[PDB]
Design a protein around this ligand. Structure first.
Ligand code: HEC
Ligand code: HEM
Ligand code: HEM
Ligand code: HEM
Ligand code: FES
Lengths: 49, 73, 378, 55, 98, 100, 65, 239, 108
């Protein structure tokens, strides 16, 4: 049953930086984190001001 | 109606979800979502707006008939 | 384990906002409950400051609003905030009501009843608030609506000179209206809490009418941030309204002292009250006019009796949807006639519009929708 | 640039709060100066500071 | 005792004490240009005396009286048939006409 | 026939063949509709909750499944109507037995 | 004195509507002269003449003002 | 009549979204109101002390406030004698009672110039067209007590036109012509109606920059936290 | 089932006034909670009547208070009811606090 489960693929949605299946994502993690957290930080700075 | 835990007895369902950091914020905004919103506009406005062109004909027609009736000096 | 799930206040906050099973379907048309809540607390706070710098007397009213517009820092911007926040409040209220009627959500009973009591309370409250500037339009509009209260025989003149404070408009009448506008929105917030309480009793809705127990998603952190986006959009629209054109929807004829012998040619309530002012001037009758007004609002209460279909929402039924958009256009037509003066051909087409309004809402909605039921081979 | 920023200002909550308040004050500075500059630059001519310059 | 308290609160919301202190006026109308309505304060309310040009009174006496919803001859309302004396506030909702 | 062509045009314009739905998914819940939903076969009830979950996720994402996946006009395996008629008959039997 | 209101008002009544409404108001003057003892004081032609003249003033007055 | 005339709008220099007023013109129109136009109208809600930092310093404010001399309060006599007025005095009412103004004018109360611009349909273009475009009464021999008025209901004002040519001589090198002084006094009355038009547009531009910077941010976060629901997809496992 | 045990308002009013358990040895000192509640609603009612007859302006405030106590129909009973109800409100408040500190209810 569960061995027949095949996960769909989402390359229409993914980031183009992590379209590389082999190269592991312990490296470009802080890039995505700092990108989104910088956006939320700019948001919170504007709302606080 | 209440909180979680009891609501409906459902089997036979799988849901695949993705962490949002793998995915972009706006995938194909100006090439797929624009035909989507153009189709959603194109469906309904030919049903919703024709009451408003009745409103605009009442606007113009009643306005000009009123000015003709009240400017007979 | 948790302080949120165990503390007897944070249990209320948790089963209100944190872990509320909310639908995964609703669009921006469902933000307007939170938008009316934020508009209401904004009206409370700005009205509180404006009431801190105000004196209610028939000479000092216009002088004091002049004092707030000139002397005190930002007093003119908080005055414009309270006025245009009332106007945006009523626009969001009618979008809320149009949502609740078009998406079939009026199959709830007690939610609808408490919402009707909210409608009466906010309409009388904002009317008294518009009487508070003591303008010429406000003086005559107070006279009009209070003698409409006197339109019922055998009680009318006594009851209305009782809620006057004499045989004419008094200083005491202005103090009465200050007190009731000053006390009503706290009752309105309490009734909004009772409204929300019965809503959390029943459960929310979708655009489709299909019950959605399979996909209850939490309110946080999804509808919290979506209400943040919608409220920031409302705040920016409100600030461009109070800054760039404060009198696009502010009527200019309010800004004179209330001369008791003045009698301007134009007279109207404020532009949200136009359809309640047009149906009065539609049918030439005193008790018939106030009775037609009461009938309009109470038939809008009657509406859950009129649902005869097998569906819930009008997303799937196109012809009764188009009939509802005819009703929307007739609402905008009554607004336009309210924006046009009291003359004869406009009263002709206003009687046409009001009787067509009642012909849609009374008769054509159940008969049209039961033809829609009958057509689907059911 | 990005990983240095996550390393410095996005590890614990108090540092994040401090850096957004300091960003708010620097934005206060630059935003007030730019806003007043552009506003009085598009209203050059019949603005009061010219008359204060004369008088 | 509760219905006494409710009725006394209803009496408390009635009016003020200067409300019972408004009375008559003398009115003299030997000043009005012809065809114009003069206003006088009376119990916090207007009081109209209009000098009518005789073309308007020729219209009113020339047009019939029984056409209305209630006919009433002009001598049954005034002793001065070329100077109309009215409480010119409306009977629908209390409005002063133009 | 004129009215049957109206019916075909109306099912085309109703817009849940676009959404991938059927006859037995558009019903408003009174008490007796809920009772007829409890009186359902197992496979039909599981298909019903899967079609409900598909229509919910689609109308969230506001996407319509393409032309190859639309529910046609008289292929429909309609099923909730006999249970619904039995529940209406039993309810009216009980109420008329109280009326007599 | 050369009044710029009056200057633009003089040089701005050169238009089609201006001249034609001027002759329409003068024939209305002829009509009130001929069909006299009336309750019609030549409203629409005169106010429309001043209306169109005030439009052409409204475009072209604050140039050197 | 009771056929109200359409007012045509005129291109102000303060009309647009970011078009500012002229404080120099406010000074001009204030001096013009002070020289002639105060004789029938009042502007009772504006004292001299509002003009501390508008266009003057305190010096010429004290000049304008002490040339005009109105009233002292009870200085242990209680008899209301004279005083120039440093800053406390308001603008003096030329006729105190309404019937006092109806005694000199033929009835004909001049309405006070606080909110005349904001109290009528049509803004300050209406008032400029009113004061600029006078014409004679064509066909109504009315009373020989009223004067014709185009942009007015009834078209009979009790006001002789105050646009007398070169009678005021304001302080620049140009003559005090008709249209210049009309535009200047109407700009001053726009300042009398709205107190802080230019500061209003200043906060409007500041909050335009606010909302222009904040709408990508909040909508970006909303799309970020709702794209999880946009990415989840359904599979069906029965046997 | 019952009307009282199904309706969402009546659930809360049932837990407040009807299905509220309480000990059986209650002395007179536990009257002061309801005394403070009834004093509070009476103060709000009298304050609403005073708000319908008060003009807050320093020259006219004292004249308006005199107009209440002399001119207004029963304005003297409503004003003195507000003042003496405030006094008895604080008296019942100190009795409530004295109970709560005496009987060890500060362990709550
Ligand atoms: C005395 C004569 C003056 C002077 C020196 C000015 N005005 Fe005018 N004004 C006067 C009267 C008697 C009236 C009211 C008419 C009546 O009640 O019969 C007015 C009215 C105005 C108005 C309002 C017109 C309207 O209500 O539509 C305006 C805008 C106005 N006056 C302007 C104005 C200005 C700008 C003046 C200085 C240049 C000015 N008036 C002088 C009488 C008089
Ligand atoms: C309890 C809170 C409130 C208080 C204390 C309050 C108080 C006031 C005061 C003092 C004024 C007069 C200010 C002025 O003259 O400019 C006013 C005006 C007004 N209020 Fe309120 N108000 C409150 C809530 C509301 C609400 C909820 C509404 C409805 C949305 C509302 C509608 C209005 C309106 C329409 C006006 C006239 C606006 C104007 O001056 O242009 N108020 N209010
Ligand atoms: C006083 C102003 C009002 C406030 C503050 C208010 C508040 C709210 C809130 C917070 C919600 C939940 C948010 C949401 O829409 O999902 C809601 C929903 C609702 N309200 Fe109101 N409401 C008001 C007026 C009304 C009125 C006048 C009615 C009609 C009688 C009404 C009927 C409803 C209905 C039917 C819903 C549920 C909609 C659905 O589930 O689809 N409300 N309201
Ligand atoms: C929100 C409800 C309330 C309103 C609207 C209200 C209103 C007023 C007003 C208008 C006055 C001045 C009029 C007068 O004294 O004749 C007043 C006075 C006073 N109020 Fe209240 N009040 C309220 C609640 C309270 C409460 C809860 C207390 C304390 C228990 C209180 C204690 C007093 C006192 C001591 C005075 C002065 C009485 C005097 O000097 O004659 N009020 N209140
Ligand atoms: S007609 Fe309605 S008030 Fe006179």
């Amino acid at each position: 049953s569960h061995t027949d489960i095949k996960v769909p693929d989402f390359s229409d949605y993914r980031r183009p930086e992590v379209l590389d299946s082999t190269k592991s994502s312990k490296e470009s993690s802080e890039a995505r984190k700092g990108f989104s957290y910088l956006i939320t930080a700019t948001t919170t700075v504007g709302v606080a001001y | 109606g209440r909180q979680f835990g009891h609501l409906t007895r459902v089997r036979h369902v799988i849901t695949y979800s993705l962490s949002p950091f793998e995915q972009r914020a706006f995938p194909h905004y100006f090439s797929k979502g624009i035909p989507n919103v153009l189709r959603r506009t194109r469906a309904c406005i030919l049903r919703v707006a024709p009451p408003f062109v009745v409103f605009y004909l009442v606007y113009t027609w009643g306005t000009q008939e009123f000015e003709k009736s009240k400017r007979k000096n | 384990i948790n302080i949120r799930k165990t503390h007897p206040l944070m249990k209320i906050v948790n089963n209100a906002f944190i872990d509320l099973p909310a639908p995964s379907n609703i669009s921006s048309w469902w933000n307007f409950g939170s938008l009316l809540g934020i508009c209401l607390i904004l009206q409370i706070l700005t009205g509180l400051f404006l009431a801190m710098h105000y004196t209610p007397d028939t000479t000092t009213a216009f002088s004091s609003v002049t004092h707030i517009c000139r002397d005190v820092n930002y007093g003119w911007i908080i005055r414009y905030m309270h006025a245009n926040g009332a106007s945006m409040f009523f626009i969001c209220l009618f979008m809320h009501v149009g949502r609740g009627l078009y998406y079939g959500s009026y199959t709830f009973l007690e939610t609808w009843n408490i919402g009707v009591i909210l409608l009466f309370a906010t309409m009388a409250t904002a009317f008294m608030g518009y009487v508070l500037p003591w303008g010429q339009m406000s003086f005559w509009g107070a006279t009009v609506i209070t003698n409409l209260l006197s339109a019922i025989p055998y009680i009318g003149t006594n009851l209305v000179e009782w809620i006057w404070g004499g045989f004419s408009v008094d200083k005491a009448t202005l103090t009465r209206f200050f007190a009731f506008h000053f006390i009503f929105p706290f009752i309105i917030a309490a009734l909004a809490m009772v409204h929300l309480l019965f809503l959390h009793e029943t459960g929310s809705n979708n655009p489709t009418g299909i019950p959605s127990d399979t996909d209850k998603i939490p309110f946080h952190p999804y509808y919290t941030i979506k209400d943040i986006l919608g409220a920031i959009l409302l705040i920016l629209i409100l600030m461009l309204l109070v800054l760039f054109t404060p009198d696009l929807l502010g009527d200019p004829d309010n800004y004179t002292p209330a001369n008791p012998l003045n009698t301007p040619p134009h007279i109207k309530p404020e532009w949200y009250f136009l359809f309640a002012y047009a149906i009065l001037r539609s049918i030439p009758n005193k008790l018939g006019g106030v009775l037609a007004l009461v009938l309009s609002i109470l038939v809008l209460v009657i509406m859950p009796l009129l649902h005869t279909s097998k569906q819930r929402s009008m997303m799937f039924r196109p012809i009764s949807q188009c009939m509802f958009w005819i009703l929307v256009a007739d609402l905008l037509t009554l607004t336009w006639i309210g924006g046009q003066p009291v003359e004869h051909p406009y009263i002709i087409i206003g009687q046409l519009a009001s009787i067509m309004y009642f012909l849609i809402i009374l008769v054509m909605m159940p008969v049209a929708s039961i033809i829609e039921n009958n057509l689907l081979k059911w | 640039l990005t990983a240095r920023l996550y390393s410095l200002l996005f590890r614990r909550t108090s540092t994040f709060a401090l850096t957004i308040v300091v960003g708010a004050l620097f934005f206060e500075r630059a935003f007030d100066q730019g806003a007043d500059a552009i506003y009085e630059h598009i209203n050059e001519g019949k603005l009061w500071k010219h008359i204060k310059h004369k008088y | 005792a509760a219905k006494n308290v409710v009725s006394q609160f209803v009496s408390s919301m009635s009016a003020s004490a200067d409300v019972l202190a408004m009375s008559k006026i003398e009115i003299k109308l030997s000043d009005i240009p012809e065809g114009k309505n003069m206003a006088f304060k009376w119990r916090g309310k207007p009081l109209f005396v209009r000098h009518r040009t005789k073309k308007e009174i020729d219209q009113e006496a020339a047009v019939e009286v029984s056409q209305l919803r209630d006919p009433q001859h002009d001598l049954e309302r005034v002793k001065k048939p070329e100077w109309v004396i009215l409480i010119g506030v409306c009977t629908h909702l209390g409005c002063v006409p133009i | 026939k004129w009215l049957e062509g109206i019916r075909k045009w109306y099912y085309n314009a109703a817009g849940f063949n676009k959404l991938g739905l059927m006859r037995d998914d558009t019903i408003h819940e009174n008490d007796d509709v809920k009772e007829a939903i409890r009186r359902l076969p197992e496979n039909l009830y599981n298909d019903r909750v899967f079609r409900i979950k598909r229509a919910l996720d689609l109308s969230m994402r506001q996407q319509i499944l393409p032309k190859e996946q639309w529910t046609k006009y008289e292929e429909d395996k309609f099923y909730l109507e006999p249970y619904l008629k039995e529940v209406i008959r039993e309810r009216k039997e009980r109420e008329e037995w109280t009326k007599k | 004195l050369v009044d710029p209101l009056t200057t633009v008002r003089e040089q701005c009544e050169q238009l089609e509507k201006c001249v034609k409404a001027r002759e329409r108001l003068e024939l209305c003057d002829e009509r009130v002269s001929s069909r006299s003892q009336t309750e019609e004081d030549c409203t629409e032609e005169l106010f429309d003449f001043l209306h169109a003249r005030d439009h052409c003033v409204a475009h072209k007055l604050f140039n050197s003002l | 009549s009771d056929l109200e005339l359409h007012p045509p709008s005129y291109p102000w220099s303060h009309r647009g979204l970011l078009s500012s007023l002229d404080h120099t013109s406010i000074r001009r129109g204030f001096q013009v109101y002070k020289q002639v136009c105060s004789s029938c109208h009042s502007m009772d809600y504006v004292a001299y002390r509002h003009l501390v930092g508008v266009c003057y310093t305190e010096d010429e404010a004290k000049a304008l406030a002490e040339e005009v001399e109105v009233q002292d309060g009870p200085n242990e006599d209680g008899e209301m004698f004279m005083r120039p007025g440093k800053l406390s005095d308001y603008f003096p009412k030329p006729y105190p009672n309404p019937e006092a103004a109806r005694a000199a004018n033929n009835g004909a109360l001049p309405p006070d110039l606080s909110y005349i611009v904001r109290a009528r349909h049509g803004g300050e273009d209406y008032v400029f067209s009113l004061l600029t475009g006078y014409c004679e009464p064509p066909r109504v021999s009315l009373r020989e007590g009223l004067y014709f008025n185009p942009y007015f209901p009834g078209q009979a004002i009790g006001m002789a036109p105050p646009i007398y040519n070169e009678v005021l001589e304001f302080d620049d090198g140009t003559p005090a012509t008709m249209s210049q002084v009309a535009k200047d006094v109407c700009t001053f009355l726009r300042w009398a109606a709205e107190p802080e038009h230019d500061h209003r547009k200043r906060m409007g531009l500041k909050m335009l920059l606010m909302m222009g910077l904040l709408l990508p941010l909040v909508y970006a976060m909303k799309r970020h936290k709702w794209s999880v629901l946009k990415s989840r997809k359904l599979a069906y496992r029965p046997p």
